[PDB]
Amino acid sequence: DSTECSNLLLQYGSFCTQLNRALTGIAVEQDKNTQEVFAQVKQIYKTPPIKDFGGFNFSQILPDPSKPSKRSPIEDLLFNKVTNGLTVLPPLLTDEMIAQYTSALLAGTITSGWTFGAGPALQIPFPMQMAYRFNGIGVTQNVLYENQKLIANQFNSAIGKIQDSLSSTP
Amino acid sequence: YTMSLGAENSVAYSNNSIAIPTNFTISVTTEILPVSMTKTSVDCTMYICG
Amino acid sequence: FCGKGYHLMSFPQSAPHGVVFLHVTYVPAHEKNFTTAPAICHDGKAHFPREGVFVSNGTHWFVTQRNFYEPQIITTDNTFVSGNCDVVIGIVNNTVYDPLQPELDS
Amino acid sequence: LQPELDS
Ligand SMILES: *[C@@H]1O[C@H](CO)[C@@H](O[C@@H]2O[C@H](CO)[C@@H](O)[C@H](O)[C@H]2NC(C)=O)[C@H](O)[C@H]1NC(C)=O
Ligand SMILES: *[C@@H]1O[C@H](CO)[C@@H](O[C@@H]2O[C@H](CO)[C@@H](O)[C@H](O)[C@H]2NC(C)=O)[C@H](O)[C@H]1NC(C)=O
Ligand SMILES: *[C@@H]1O[C@H](CO)[C@@H](O[C@@H]2O[C@H](CO)[C@@H](O)[C@H](O)[C@H]2NC(C)=O)[C@H](O)[C@H]1NC(C)=O
Ligand SMILES: *[C@@H]1O[C@H](CO)[C@@H](O[C@@H]2O[C@H](CO)[C@@H](O)[C@H](O)[C@H]2NC(C)=O)[C@H](O)[C@H]1NC(C)=O
Ligand SMILES: *[C@@H]1O[C@H](CO)[C@@H](O[C@@H]2O[C@H](CO)[C@@H](O)[C@H](O)[C@H]2NC(C)=O)[C@H](O)[C@H]1NC(C)=O
Ligand SMILES: *[C@@H]1O[C@H](CO)[C@@H](O)[C@H](O)[C@H]1NC(C)=O
């Protein structure tokens, strides 16, 4: 609040304007980065109420309705595990909207595969989508269909091991 | 206002139904990327001292 | 990476201190619902699409490419056989046409 | 297949 200090500071010119402009550019660059990373879909997709995905379990990555934050258990664990002229500007996207964006992306990639990323969301059964991904890496559909229960069990076990590893590693 | 992330689109998922496209759109989009800046040279002695 | 949609091609244009890419892409449109099955059960054998997908418009079953609706008769030329019908979950019963079948009859 | 059914 010193007037004499500001009067002496005015002799140095527009340094303060340069620093404020640089910090403003950084602050808008963070919001631009968040838009570029998370806001890649203009449609808010939702999962069906019936979780019939041919044995595949997505409860650990889908948002929990019981939680007020509308986060997944994995995302809730991630949020729990992260802990004089200065001001902190809030981000343009809040945490619940970022979680909503991730939920929309999860619903799109579960219910529609990769079709929603290239245009309108085209529904497809999830085992058929997994068979398409198997054909992408050069494995025939029959291998996926015959061992569908084993693949779903391995996927659920791997997701549970991921949750255990995140909960057990500082 | 509180910003809407997007229009809601509930995908009609079921275990035995698929959606197959019957038509297509040839879409042309623009992407602008900067390549270079203005090449500026400053004579340090002439700038500071003339 | 090269525009929204399935990338077909791109065209470069010069700009003052910059480049403009015109991305020509393929976007699906006018989608239609169909009833789908993972495999077709015929003569105690499971049939799987070689490159396409089994679709049904309500009464008849066809095989089509995944990115465009082009229904064709389910034959042995666009399907392959692996195993019986007891393993695949959701396999349905439908006939499979044989192109060689009218030939030896005549 | 054409020579096959001929013979
Ligand atoms: C998917 O996984 C979740 C958890 O991984 C399963 O929920 C469990 O269900 C059992 C039996 O109903 C309960 O004893 C557990 O307490 C539940 N755990 C949690 C975290 O809710 C769920 O049953 C699985 N299957 C489906 C179809 O959702
Ligand atoms: C696929 O979509 C195109 C439009 O992109 C359709 O072409 C139009 O067809 C109507 C009637 O058939 C004409 O009146 C328009 O002038 C056409 N537009 C253009 C740009 O040519 C086409 O018919 C559609 N095909 C199918 C099978 O639905
Ligand atoms: C495929 O079938 C689904 C299920 O009926 C259709 O989804 C419905 O569409 C109508 C018309 O827009 C809506 O009023 C309903 O609310 C939708 N239901 C659900 C559960 O989403 C869908 O439109 C059909 N697709 C096509 C291309 O006809
Ligand atoms: C599904 O598509 C097939 C192929 O077009 C339809 O079969 C034809 O239906 C017309 C309708 O009058 C008949 O005149 C033809 O004789 C049928 N063809 C054959 C080979 O039988 C079928 O009706 C369609 N089903 C639905 C529910 O739309
Ligand atoms: C598809 O066809 C098979 C046989 O070609 C059917 O299997 C029969 O089902 C009946 C009643 O469930 C049994 O009594 C027979 O013993 C079965 N035969 C064999 C060889 O498994 C099957 O039910 C048919 N599926 C549908 C949906 O009609
Ligand atoms: C699909 O879900 C229905 C429930 O209405 C069930 O009867 C049917 O057996 C299921 N099919 C497959 C292949 O899971």
From Swiss-Prot, chain A:
Record: glycosylation sites: N57
Site (Cleavage): residue numbering on this chain: R71, S72
Function: Precursor of the fusion protein processed in the biosynthesis of the S protein and the formation of virus particle. Mediates fusion of the virion and cellular membranes by functioning as a class I viral fusion protein. Contains two viral fusion peptides that are unmasked after cleavage. The S2/S2' cleavage occurs during virus entry at the cell membrane by host TMPRSS2 or during endocytosis by host CSTL.
Name of protein: Spike protein S2
Shown stretch of the complete protein: 745 to 942 of 1273
Curated annotation (Swiss-Prot), chain D:
Source taxon at top rank: Viruses
Purpose: Subunit of the fusion protein that is processed upon entry into the host cell. Mediates fusion of the virion and cellular membranes by functioning as a class I viral fusion protein. Contains a viral fusion peptide that is unmasked after S2 cleavage. This cleavage can occur at the cell membrane by host TMPRSS2 or during endocytosis by host CSTL. In either case, this triggers an extensive and irreversible conformational change that leads to fusion of the viral envelope with the cellular cytoplasmic membrane, releasing viral genomic RNA into the host cell cytoplasm.
Protein name as annotated: Spike protein S2'
